[PDB]
Structure formats: C-alpha cells, structure tokens
Amino acid sequence: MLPGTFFEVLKNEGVVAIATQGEDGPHLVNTWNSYLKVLDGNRIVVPVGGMHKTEANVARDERVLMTLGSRKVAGRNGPGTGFLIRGSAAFRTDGPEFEAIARFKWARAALVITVVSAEQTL
C-alpha cells in the first residue's frame, strides 16, 4: 500500500533507485520516472535493458528496496523529495508490465516490483 503522494511524485520527473538483493551484495541501481510504469494493486515496473547484476540478483532473491523521488517537489536534499519503499521483484517478458514498457526500444525485461510498504525520507 502507498500514499497518494507516492503516485504524485511518480507523475513528475525524478530519479529512482532499486536495491536488488541477490547474494554477492545488493546492487542499488538507478532509473527515471519517465521510464517507469505503475499498475493496480500498487505493482510498479522498471524497464531492465542493462541491469545485469540486478538480473542475477533477482534470479537469486526477490528482495528489493526502491527509493523514488522528484525534482519538482521540495524535500530535505535540495528541492527534491522522495520515499524509501520495499517489495518483491520479478523479471517478466510477458504481461501488462512488458506491454506498457514495450513503448521503449532497449528493454530486455520488465523488472516488475510488487511493492508492500513505503516511508517518506528524502
């Protein structure tokens, strides 16, 4: 479950990060809201085109942390706010995830995240 404020930050431009737990250390990678997609049941998706260690890390462990933010709403670090979130990841080359990310031309997979809980931080 997520606050309305989460969605409103996704609606805007910002950077996001995804800490993919695997085994040989979690890999806190980056992405842009302009590349992400939200689904119902608060499921979110990231287009994986070159998140390699993250591919191995999801394949070993579903555990992921996700930091999102925007440059259009003021937080603590400069005029940019965001949240720390947790969920289970799953790579898919199928579903409304892969369809709604198909709009890109460099996606190798839809890194689907089944978010569970958020807290506002930055």
Ligand SMILES: Cc1cc2nc3c(=O)[nH]c(=O)nc-3n(C[C@H](O)[C@H](O)[C@H](O)COP(=O)(O)O)c2cc1C
């Ligand atoms: C700001 C930023 C956004 C990025 N966005 C994406 C993205 O949405 N999808 C992607 O596959 N690669 C993206 N990358 C490139 C790499 O995937 C990213 O650097 C990642 O850490 C590499 O992780 P890996 O060791 O698992 O390959 C992005 C890199 C940066 C710095």
